[PDB]
Amino acid sequence: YFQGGMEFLVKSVRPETLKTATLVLAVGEGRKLGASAKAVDDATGGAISAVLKRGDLAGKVGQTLLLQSLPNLKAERVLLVGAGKERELGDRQYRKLASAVLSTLKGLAGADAALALGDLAVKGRGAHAKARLLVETLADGLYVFDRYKSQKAEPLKLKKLTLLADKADSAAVEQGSKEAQAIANGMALTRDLGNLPPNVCHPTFLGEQAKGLAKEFKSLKVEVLDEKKLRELGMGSFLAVAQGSDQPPRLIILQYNGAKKDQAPHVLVGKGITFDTGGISLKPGLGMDEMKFDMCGAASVFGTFRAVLELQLPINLVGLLACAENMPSGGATRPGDIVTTMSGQTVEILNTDAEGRLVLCDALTYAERFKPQSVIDIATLTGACIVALGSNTSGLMGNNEALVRQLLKAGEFADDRAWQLPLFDEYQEQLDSPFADIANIGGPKAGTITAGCFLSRFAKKYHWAHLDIAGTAWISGGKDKGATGRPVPLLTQYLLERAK
Amino acid sequence: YFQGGMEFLVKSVRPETLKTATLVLAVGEGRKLGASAKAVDDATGGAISAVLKRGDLAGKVGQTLLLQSLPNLKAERVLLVGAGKERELGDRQYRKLASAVLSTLKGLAGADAALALGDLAVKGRGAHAKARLLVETLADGLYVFDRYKSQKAEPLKLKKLTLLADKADSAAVEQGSKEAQAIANGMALTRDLGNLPPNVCHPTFLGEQAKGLAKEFKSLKVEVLDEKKLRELGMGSFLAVAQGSDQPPRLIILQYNGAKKDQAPHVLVGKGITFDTGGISLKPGLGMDEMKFDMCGAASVFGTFRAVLELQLPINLVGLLACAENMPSGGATRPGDIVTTMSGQTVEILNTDAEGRLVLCDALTYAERFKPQSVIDIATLTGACIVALGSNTSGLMGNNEALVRQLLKAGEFADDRAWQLPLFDEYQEQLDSPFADIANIGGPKAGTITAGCFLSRFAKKYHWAHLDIAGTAWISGGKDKGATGRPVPLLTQYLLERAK
Ligand SMILES: [Cl-]
Ligand SMILES: [Cl-]
Ligand SMILES: [Cl-]
Ligand SMILES: [Cl-]
Ligand SMILES: [Cl-]
Ligand SMILES: [Cl-]
Ligand SMILES: [Cl-]
Ligand SMILES: [Cl-]
Ligand SMILES: [Cl-]
Ligand SMILES: [Cl-]
Ligand code: NA
Ligand code: NA
Ligand code: NA
Ligand code: NA
Ligand code: NA
Ligand code: NA
Ligand code: NA
Ligand code: NA
Ligand code: NA
Ligand code: NA
């Protein structure tokens, strides 16, 4: 169940007799009230119709009108929210409607609210799929990160949200709500870890977080490998990234065995660069505070595990979090260094700011021992991905078409979308080095793709895919600056489908 | 008395019978010789008039004509200096005249010179105020910094300067000269500390300098706090600046009790960043050698104390020098770090090159314990101040209008001027952070002001002002590159007035 201060219930009772602090109804733009709103209007003797006739609420998506006590209702307030003029909403409009409702309710002193929104239609979504989107939007919309504020906002009075559904849909709605709550809990852990400042959130801290998660979930086993063990394993490019920082690196291994021992596991590999200065290839100063989000890949592995552990899915899951801090220093890796990866391939490190792939490639080699049926790495890897796909769609590459399709489908269902980019063999020659087996960077052309090509050289032994979340893992500026928790919804949906 | 190799005397004798190696007289452009010059001309039987009639000296400000022995004079040489055609000189012209005189005298083998310049008028300045400007310009014009030159210039022969004044003005001239000499001595210490290279002038060195000043002045008490004590005090942003450098930080506390114990002290807070690389937010290489001047704020607190201690002013004075070195390293503060200042306010360090305010804010909190009647911080804080006000006028902000006015008036009298910039409440929102109580930088707009706004959040408990000397503390290039010693003249004049 959701942990962020909200209980979500599903009930099949009549809205017009439900006791609640706020009853929420949808109002169309220039079309008749839906069945639920009409039943409530009838119960009040036409009071809602009479208000709407006065014209303050045009009915555009997300517009609101709040009424107090109406005759013959047990609702203390009635919140009208506009649903536009279309027969069906798209996902974006449904989310906008839900967020407008939540924003209003947050500011009220009501301890609960009941959503009578079952008459809304959303393109391509039945009861379960609508509940997944609605509850995830509501629950994630409650997220707060204020532990470093001396002045904290007043706690919400709102503590309970009831979804009204016809009895024939209530089981699907309940299922969707339960899954959405687990996803939102995972997103909240991901966002917390992403938002923590890098002087607190370093690799050792992430190791202790993993141990704490195992304390909470007896089904989770955790092992944390330090720099001595990494050197024993021959993890040369991983160590090269870490060596310039005072902070020691960590390889965190999470294991959950929800299925029979004969089922091959799915492996999630997360880039956990807790801060990325670029190293000797130093980044510019402007906006470099957002490099604390360079561990959002690893954070999303935490969050996906958190959701899976709550749902107790019948799957075998492994998490590999490759965490290091990338700092300049008198002992840092230099451009031109050549290192031997755990696979034995030598890499010429042309640019020390292309370091995510250097911790990932050793983790991908490590993943071979699990004989996985799928391996997915998640990383804030290339600014080129933002040029290619922006901030709303993650880049996706892989060496197996069926797995890539499974991830695309999961992202569509989750409304946490990705988009495939090709790993054509012609791109690989961009990584040729006169000195070593591989150069760690290509040119300025096709940067997201050549990063995927680099990783692919370590993933040939299994079905593998790669999510570039450089654009989707956080919001850069404004009031809403901070980690997003993506791609936890995509990944959790992928695993939900693999668990059937 | 001035310590840089010059004795300054005031005498009321007739210039035309004074024994001296060089007698200095002013000559107007196209107006009759003044009273003193005319008396000397008469004594020579018209020899000076006869030379001037030949036309080599037009009389423009600072032009010179040097004569040898003239009939009936006891002066071995007579130096004529042009004073222009105006009835009164401005401060700039008076300084230019004085510097031209000094430049000539420096090149002569005369052991002394007598200045018969009492007939010069300077706008808004009586005898005391003219003597303040003249002697300070002369004494500071003798400054030399050559300890790293293997080949040193020949020592000056000039060792004594006599100011001739009418008996009715001689007491005021003597007072002005005494104060100007103390100010020039303080400026020389400030300039020395500013000009020292940063591999010599680090925080520990500045601590030893403070101890040495207490050895020289029994009225001064000094305490030097190291990093352990700073951590005990909770000085988190100060420590964050220092942590990347091998050089430990120092908080230097100077105390002078020249008044009764019931008089609240005045506190000077100086930024002593002995070198500023920018840290992880690294500066460009061009001109970064001038970042050794990033401790000129603290240096000016040294210099102001040096002048006050010589004058034995009846005031209670405290100096707080917050000194650290700002270096990149594997343990340096990272953009995005959040730290807790000694006040308890949390700060998100968006840019590690805005570090002066991070050592200053903890020092401003520390200053509360003295129950001060005024607190002035001095810092080379923002390049934006140079854009706003250039290299000749310091920026001034504060939370108390009377104190700001007192400092402006002192700067006008000293001809070491400042100019107020507003700390309107509307600017404060530029420092909002989604994560912490304060961000350490605003945007690119109003950078000098938002830095002052940041400091103001730590100064609410007392009357406070802030001098941005990024433009006035040093000269960037050319033959005269080096520290200026400003704002020691402004600060010392402020304290002279507070001592009445
Ligand atoms: Cl159904
Ligand atoms: Cl750990
Ligand atoms: Cl360790
Ligand atoms: Cl976009
Ligand atoms: Cl799916
Ligand atoms: Cl007088
Ligand atoms: Cl010291
Ligand atoms: Cl020390
Ligand atoms: Cl200027
Ligand atoms: Cl004054
Ligand atoms: Na619509
Ligand atoms: Na839509
Ligand atoms: Na990087
Ligand atoms: Na990175
Ligand atoms: Na290229
Ligand atoms: Na003139
Ligand atoms: Na002038
Ligand atoms: Na700086
Ligand atoms: Na500085
Ligand atoms: Na700005």
Residue numbers in the entry:
A (entry chain A), B (entry chain A): 17 to 516
The paper states:
Intracellular leucine aminopeptidases (PepA) are metalloproteases from the family M17. These enzymes catalyze peptide bond cleavage, removing N-terminal residues from peptide and protein substrates, with consequences for protein homeostasis and quality control. Here, we dissected the catalytic and chemical mechanisms of PaPepA: a leucine aminopeptidase from Pseudomonas aeruginosa. Solved structures reveal the presence of a PaPepA hexamer, which displays high similarity with E. coli, bovine lens, and P. putida PepA hexamers (RMSD between 0.4 and 0.5 in comparison to PaPepA).
The apo enzyme occupied the metal binding sites, with likely Na+ ions present in the purification buffer. PaPepA did not copurify with Zn2+ if metal was absent from the purification buffer, according to crystal structures and fluorescence data. RMSD between apo and bestatin-bound PaPepA is 0.21 Å, and the RMSD between the apo structure and Mn2+ bound PaPepA is 0.21 Å. Major features of the protein structure are identical in all three crystal forms.
